[PDB]
Every structure is written in structure tokens, then in C-alpha cells.
């Protein structure tokens, strides 16, 4: 399951949506667009924990972020936006304070986003998929989805 959040220039979440049924179960019930960045990330993880989808027994989470580079002004400020974006999720992570849980962050450009749109899949998942192709391992979206993120990382 993957969860996609939309934020504004003010680093404020405006729209929250789940791409998967499991994702909707955890994403649903979250009312706080103003502070969904850190709060939703930590609450969602707990929701998954309660549902049983995620187990504290060694769990890796991959988070991908993308900014609009179409604007020159945005590109320059992009470095500042990226640093703040990482910091906001960092706080959520600090909230969890779970040693067994390790986070990972990556950057996504418009090129990857366009590809994600074509495949109607989350850009974050696309990133992992890209690595799989490089490895040459026969990996598919459904198979990876059925497998845990931690399991995918460790091969």
C-alpha cells in the first residue's frame, strides 16, 4: 500500500489520499490538513501497526518527494524546500522513536512523475522498481507489493 500527500509552498498539506485499500484504512480518519505532514505520517504508521500490516519487528519505510522544477524560482528555492521537507518527516520519525524502524528518503524529478502517471503508480514505488531493473531481478509491482519493503531491501 502507498500513501500520497499533497503540500503547498508553505509546506502545508492540502490534500490527503490513499492509493491502496489498506492505505485508505490508515489514511482515513485523518483530519488536519494544516499539520498532516508530520502528524499523518506518524498516525498512519500506527494505524498500519494496529491493522497488523506493519510489524515493529524490523520495518523499513521508503519515502519519496518531488517538487515542481518547471519554475526557475522554485528550482533555486528547491534546496530549501527539500531540507524542510526532510525535516518535517524527520520530526514524525522522532515521534515514533522506534529503533527497529529505519527510514529512507529519495528525490523524484518530473521525469519519474510522468512515468508514474503512465503506470498509474506511486513515484516512490517506481523508484524501487527502477532499482530492480538495474539489478536484473525479475520483479513486478504486484509481487513487490505483496512483499514487505524491508524484505525487498534485503536480498
Amino acid at each position: 500500500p502507498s500513501v500520497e500527500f499533497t503540500i503547498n509552498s508553505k509546506h502545508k498539506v492540502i490534500v490527503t489520499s490513499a492509493i491502496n485499500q489498506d492505505a485508505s484504512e490508515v489514511l482515513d480518519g485523518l483530519e488536519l490538513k494544516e499539520k498532516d505532514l508530520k502528524s499523518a505520517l506518524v498516525m498512519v504508521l500506527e494505524k498500519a501497526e494496529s491493522l497488523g500490516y506493519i510489524s515493529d519487528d524490523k520495518n523499513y519505510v521508503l519515502v519519496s518527494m518531488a517538487l515542481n522544477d518547471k519554475n526557475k524560482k522554485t528550482r533555486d528555492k528547491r534546496e530549501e524546500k527539500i531540507d524542510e521537507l526532510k525535516e518535517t518527516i524527520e520530526q514524525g520519525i522522532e515521534a515514533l522513536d522506534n529503533d527497529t524502524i529505519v527510514h529512507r528518503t529519495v528525490t523524484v524529478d518530473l521525469e519519474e512523475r510522468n512515468k508514474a502517471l503512465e503506470n498509474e503508480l506511486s513515484m516512490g514505488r517506481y523508484y524501487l522498481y527502477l532499482e530492480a531493473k538495474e539489478k536484473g531481478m525479475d520483479i513486478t509491482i504486484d509481487e513487490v507489493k505483496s512483499s514487505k519493503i524491508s524484505d525487498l531491501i534485503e536480498k
Binding site: 500500500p1 502507498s2 500513501v3 500520497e4 500527500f5 499533497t6 503540500i7 503547498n8 509552498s9 492540502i14 490534500v15 505520517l41 498512519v44 504508521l45 498500519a48 500490516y53 506493519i54 519505510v61 521508503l62 519515502v63 519519496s64 518527494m65 518531488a66 517538487l67 515542481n68 522554485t74 524546500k81 521537507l85 523524484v108 506511486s122 513515484m123 516512490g124 514505488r125 524501487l128 507489493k145 512483499s147 514487505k148 519493503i149
Partner: peptide, 12 residues
């Protein structure tokens, strides 16, 4: 254009 930026999270 309305959405300035967006982020995605992959978790199983």
C-alpha cells in the same frame, strides 16, 4: 498548478 508540491510514501 494548484498543487505546488507533493510527496509519496511506500510502506507494506
Amino acid at each position: 498548478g494548484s498543487e505546488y508540491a507533493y510527496v509519496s510514501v511506500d510502506v507494506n
